[model samples]
Target: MIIGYFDGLCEPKNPGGIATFGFVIYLDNRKIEGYGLAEKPFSINSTNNVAEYSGLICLMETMLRLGISSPIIKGDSQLVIKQMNGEYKVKAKRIIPLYEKAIELKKKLNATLIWVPREENKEADRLSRVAYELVRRGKLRDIGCIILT
Candidate 1:
């Protein structure tokens, strides 16, 4: 089974700020793993919820590109996880579209979304912070995926 861990962050602000997302995919019990961060463009005018959704979107698209199926998605955002699991309602107008897109991706991947504690998702959190810092420092210029095996 493929295991996907995802996390997102918006620094110095919540509803509006510099945002970044990260995900790690482990195949066959961590025998093979891949992780990446979203490009900078997605962070423009983004929120924490948007960042969270964007991570899942990136993960879903990557899995599709790799022909991966039925991944078990783990995330640190309770709002995103519960919303994806139909346990919470998405009421924010700005987040409605993101919520819809995430649902579509979830359906496309036949994936399961689960919520974990922040401490349990350190790698993904670290990756997201790296992306945020890179953007903050004006280091990321190109639009591409940084694949780490």
Candidate 2:
């Protein structure tokens, strides 16, 4: 079974600070791959919701690249979880594009999106902070799905 967890943040401030995302994939409870990267900062599109949605999209994109299917996608963002599962509407203009991208990926993978408690998502959270620090140091670019090597 493949399981995926993702998380994101806009630190120092919500709308003006740097945003980053992280995700980890496990097969049969064994971690196989993980990723994190900074996305945007100090832009009109920068916000916690945007970062959250980006995290989900990043996770799904990576899964597709890895040929994974029907995996369980878990995250701590209530807005993203509800919106993807159809419990909430994608009403925010800033989030519409990201939401649509996630919907498209979901249609391809039939992935299960779940909302877990924050404590349950520590690894993905830490990985996002790793990206935040890396970007703050200029070691990583302001983009998602960075091929860190």
Candidate 3:
């Protein structure tokens, strides 16, 4: 089975920080694709919640583009995983749109969203830090909010 791991990071501050995302795709320990990207930097969109959604969005989009379906998606964000699985409700206007888009993608991809501990998601977390640094150096470009290097 294909497994995708994702993580988000908001650096320096929460709302004021740069929100970045990272994800890695694997098939039973063999890595396939890895990505680190900035979501929103110093903008109203910059937040851990947005970043988390961004990572999952990118992962799902990539899978669909590759004609992959029914994959397991793992992330460190409890809120994202729970919300995706319908265990929690989203109320924030800032996140409702994101949550909507994410659910749309989840259905399209026939994906499973699961929560993992931080250590289990370390690779994706490190990539998110890379995204932050790239944003700091002005080397990353955002394409439809999926800013990657």
Candidate 4:
């Protein structure tokens, strides 16, 4: 199966918290393929790391739901990719859970997590922005009509 990966970051106007997002989609290479979004606007004293982990959890949930037992997970966060790939160690308590969750997902799916530069993740990141806009505006529509091709 072909899978797509995406990550997003949200800097709220107020310095309350930052929201980071990521997602992975498993598809059959055609026909409005399956997709997922990892999104959550943190309202507490959370950092970008927290958001990144939350997004990963969301991706894992989607992969499980689709029964994708061996999907390729992607993200634009270099730090996250390195950590997941074992190039870096989990040092922050806030990030430990996220790392554990990712490990659990990997075990369940028999999968690998890869890192792609931000430019390649534009589509997924755009989708994340669209989701945020929808929430902020209290509406849902084609926010990517002109740019998502």
Candidate 5:
């Protein structure tokens, strides 16, 4: 089974700001990571929740593309993990579509979403900050896209 950790961040504000998503993939102890900032033209008006959703979306997309299965996903966002696991109600209109998308991908991957503490999610958090800086400095231009490494 594949193990994955994901995180996202929005700087200066929420609901409208520079945002980035980060993810780390693990097979046993081996690790791979990726991150990207939201770019212009097609960039979503981002909040912390949107960024969190984007991280999961990117993780699932990468898993599908790489033919990974039975993934165990970890994230620091309680709302995202709970909602994705059907433990919490999704009440925001903006989040509904993202929640639905995550559900679809979860089914495809036979995945489980788990909530972890922020300290346990440091690598992904670091990558998220890296991506955030890239956006802040106008260095990344891949809108609605994730760059895996």
Candidate 6:
């Protein structure tokens, strides 16, 4: 089955906001993966919600590029999960576009987006953090190891 993992971080610099990372795992006969990050001019200026939403969008875009028509998307943010699943109403204008984009993407594929606990998503999370650190350290290369599990 194909699976997508997404995570986000929002610090005091952007209180009540988020910075996010998205990774997708392709599990066909063999495993393949891809990742995407939100492109904002300033790294530390986005809200937590925005980042999380961006992460989801990034994941979808990557999947589209891979020609992956359908996949299960997994994320850790309760707010994003609820909103995307229609469990919670979306009331923020800032979230509307992201939510709409996600819905649009969903319509294009036979997909389901669900909430998963952090423990189950360590690999994607680790890769996301490592990628950020790579940028911070000015290092260039693969973000981390990918051993078959």
Each candidate: how many clashes?
0, 0, 0, 0, 0, 5
Ordered list by TM-score, greatest first: 2, 5, 3, 1, 6, 4
Once model 4 is optimally superposed onto the true structure by TM-score, how far is the C-alpha of residue 2 displaced, in angstroms? 3.1
> What is candidate 1's lDDT per residue for 21-88, written digit by digit as tens?
77888776553333333334444556777777777777777787788888888988998999889999
lDDT of 3 at 136: 86
List the candidates ranked by lDDT, beginning with the highest. 5, 2, 3, 1, 6, 4
Model 1's number of clashes is 0
lDDT of 4: 0.60
Best of the candidates, lDDT? 5
- How displaced is residue 21 in candidate 2, in Å? 0.7
Candidate 6: the clashing residue pairs are 9-19, 17-47, 17-48, 18-47, 18-48
List the candidates' TM-scores in order: 0.83, 0.91, 0.89, 0.74, 0.89, 0.74
- Cα shift from native, residue 62, model 2 (Å): 0.9
Clash-forming residue pairs, model 5? none
Which one wins by TM-score: 5 or 6? 5
lDDT of 6 by residue, 1-149 (tens): 57877765554346432243546565656554444334342344456677677767777766776688778988888899898888999978877878999888876766798888889877666655644554445552332222223
Q: What's the distance in Å from true for residue 21, model 6?
A: 1.0
Better of 3 and 4 by lDDT: 3
For model 2, what is the alpha-carbon lDDT of residue 26? 78
Better of 1 and 2 by TM-score: 2
Model 2, range 9-94, lDDT digits (tens) per residue? Answer: 98778788888887888766466444555455666667777777777888899889889989899999988899999999888887
lDDT of 3 by residue, 6-91 (tens): 88887778876888888878755556544455455687667888888888888888778778889999998999999989999999
Query: In candidate 4, what are the lDDT values of residues 86-129, reduced to their tens digit?
Result: 89999887678778987888789877878888788776676566
At residue 26, candidate 6 shows an lDDT of 57
Which candidate tops TM-score? Answer: 2
TM-score of 4: 0.74
Off by over 4 Å in 3: 28-30, 36-39, 143-149
Which sections of candidate 6 miss by over 4 Å?
16-18, 29-45, 135-149
Error of 5 at 126 (Å): 0.6
Off by over 4 Å in 5: 28-30, 38-44
